[PDB]
């Protein structure tokens, strides 16, 4: 949750009217930043639209991602050939309870992790030739490794601490889920029980099934987001027909004062 | 590499017939990033559909949420149509109110 991660993507052959390079920035589990090459400006997202911000903050984010935009596209000249290629970046840092930062700098090519940035040496590296070629092409650009290290060791912890002291409400946002427990016929003399949680934040949430109060399983479940950054979940369980009402669903979430028991609909 | 998308369809809030809501199609776990997603009302494409930023998880696979405002109904039939290079034919997942 005390993490700031940039998800960067460059594609060598973007469909017409789609960006060759785009970035989403994340404070824990919610997105705070948006950038693509077609528009060329970093924007706040979600709650951060209303975060009280210092002047030139998003200009600075835009400046840094623009540099990374040219570099990601340069990496395709280094590989040569036709591709097509997808280059992904996982850059950022994470605060610990000691107010110290741990950085992250990983890269993936065509869906496979192939290269990272070493912050003790200030170089990019990886096991295979494609890593070394991209590494060498970026080393060539003047001060590319310098800006790379600065982004990770100074800018990221700084941006993260700024959002902690002025967007503290957004991260500590606690939205309890709305719960439903419905049953439907599934098989000769069998039903499926689905316990669903709606529009909750943070995403940490546990669903379990009780039969007459006794434990009865987790069910097979699925998490997913909503358009506003909140989350959805549901687990299902196969029960005897006519026995459905003897079950209930118990949900644990930081937005609830205590575990909530949910019983079958009417 | 290639990864086949995973498709989840659900509403933002508990479904109540006659009451406005939001229908979500969450497409995840796919590679490469080119994907095509339609939300359907009784088999016809809904025109006013939005989506989130194309993002990706820690295993580098991409995910994407499509969503539209709608009003559920006992009769109306909603589905999500997804096409991806890993699919021989478009994959249509019906919205089940239970989830």
């Amino acid at each position: 949750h005390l993490s700031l991660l940039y998800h960067l993507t460059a594609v060598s052959s973007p469909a017409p009217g789609t960006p060759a390079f785009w970035v989403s920035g994340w404070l824990g589990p919610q997105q705070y930043l948006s950038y693509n090459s077609l528009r060329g400006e970093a924007e706040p997202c979600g709650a951060w639209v209303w975060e009280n911000q210092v002047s030139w903050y998003w200009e600075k984010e835009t400046t840094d991602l623009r540099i990374k935009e040219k570099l990601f596209l340069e990496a395709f000249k280094a590989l040569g050939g036709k591709g097509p290629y997808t280059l992904q970046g996982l850059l950022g840092c994470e605060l610990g309870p000691d107010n110290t930062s741990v950085p992250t700098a990983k890269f993936a090519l065509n869906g496979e992790e192939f290269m990272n940035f070493d912050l003790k040496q200030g170089t990019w590296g990886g096991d295979w030739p494609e890593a070394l070629a991209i590494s060498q092409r970026w080393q060539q650009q003047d001060k590319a490794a310098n800006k790379e290290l600065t982004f990770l060791l100074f800018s990221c912890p700084h941006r993260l601490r700024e959002h902690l002291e002025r967007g503290r409400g957004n991260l500590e946002w606690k939205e309890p889920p709305s719960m439903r427990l419905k049953a439907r016929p599934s098989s000769p003399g069998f039903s499926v029980l689905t316990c669903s949680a709606f529009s909750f934040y943070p995403p940490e949430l546990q669903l379990r099934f009780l039969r007459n109060g006794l434990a009865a399983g987790t069910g097979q479940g699925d998490f997913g987001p909503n358009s506003d950054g909140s989350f959805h979940a549901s687990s299902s369980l196969t029960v005897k027909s006519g026995d459905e009402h003897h079950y209930c669903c118990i949900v644990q979430h930081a937005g609830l004062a205590q575990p909530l028991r949910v019983e079958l609909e009417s | 590499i290639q990864r086949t998308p995973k498709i989840q369809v659900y509403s933002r809030h508990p479904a109540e017939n006659g009451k406005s809501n939001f229908l979500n199609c969450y497409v995840s776990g796919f590679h490469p990033s080119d994907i095509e997603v339609d939300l359907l009302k009784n088999g016809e494409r809904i025109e006013k559909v939005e989506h989130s930023d194309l993002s990706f998880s820690k295993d580098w696979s991409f995910y994407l949420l499509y969503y539209t405002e709608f009003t559920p109904t006992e009769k109306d039939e909603y589905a999500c149509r997804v096409n991806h290079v890993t699919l021989s034919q478009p994959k249509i997942v019906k919205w089940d109110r239970d989830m």
Partner: antibody
Framework: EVQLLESGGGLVQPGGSLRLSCAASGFTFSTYAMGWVRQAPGKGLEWVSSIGASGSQTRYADSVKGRFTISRDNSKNTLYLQMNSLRAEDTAVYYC?????????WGQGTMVTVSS | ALTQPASVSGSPGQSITISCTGTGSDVGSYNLVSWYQQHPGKAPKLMIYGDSERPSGVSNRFSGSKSGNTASLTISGLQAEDEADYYCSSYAGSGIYVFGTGTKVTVLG
């Protein structure tokens, strides 16, 4: 200045084992993936195996899967190739190779003969 | 799975072409074609990489190209010392290579 020297070539009975070596010099060894490419007498090049720059990932052709084990010692600047369960058709010159996108450096080769 | 004609021949100063078949990549994957020249009793020499790029100190007369399942090496201004074995090579990434069948070039006259 870049130099690669294969060692360990010789004659082996079928079913036996043999460890080839390659002494690298003239570059930062730990930066580069390394590989082995073999050539049977009067025949084409056959890529055998590759190993990541740090040794954490290895690759093998179908023809040698499970019998050969490429490995690496970066402190000693040396590439290894442990061949077990040798079959007659493994007879070849075995080339040490530095892997790169835009350049290719090889050794002189070392002769491996598999014969009763 | 790379396939080459067994031999090609030409006259001094002309251009010849050696074809490579099997250089196709799946969707979401890629490959890079290299061309190697091998003179008798010698290690191969890299002549073309990245489908069409020449290393430092390789003659202008060598050029390469890829197109779908076929890559081709073209030797122009054919000289006698161009007589050798030529192999196409495909790097698919993650350390996996495949070598072509090989083509012996002879220079007529």
């Amino acid at each position: 200045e870049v130099q690669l020297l294969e060692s360990g070539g010789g004659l082996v009975q079928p079913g036996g084992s043999l460890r080839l070596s390659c002494a690298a010099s003239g570059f930062t060894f730990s930066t580069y993936a390394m590989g082995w490419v073999r050539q049977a007498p009067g025949k084409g090049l056959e890529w055998v195996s590759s190993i990541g720059a740090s040794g954490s990932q290895t690759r093998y052709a179908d023809s040698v899967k499970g019998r050969f084990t490429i490995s690496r010692d970066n402190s000693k600047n040396t590439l290894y190739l442990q061949m077990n369960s040798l079959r007659a058709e493994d007879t070849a010159v075995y080339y040490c190779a530095r892997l790169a996108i835009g350049d290719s450096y090889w050794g002189q080769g070392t002769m491996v003969t598999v014969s009763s | 799975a790379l396939t080459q004609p067994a031999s090609v021949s030409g006259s001094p100063g002309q251009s010849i072409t050696i074809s490579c078949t099997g250089t196709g990549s799946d969707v979401g994957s890629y490959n890079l074609v290299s061309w190697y020249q091998q003179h008798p009793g010698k290690a191969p020499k890299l002549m073309i990489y990245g489908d069409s790029e020449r290393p430092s100190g390789v003659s202008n007369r060598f050029s390469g190209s890829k197109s779908g399942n076929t890559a081709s090496l073209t030797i122009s201004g054919l000289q006698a010392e161009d007589e050798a074995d030529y192999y196409c090579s495909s790097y698919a990434g993650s350390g996996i290579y495949v070598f072509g069948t090989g083509t012996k070039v002879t220079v007529l006259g």
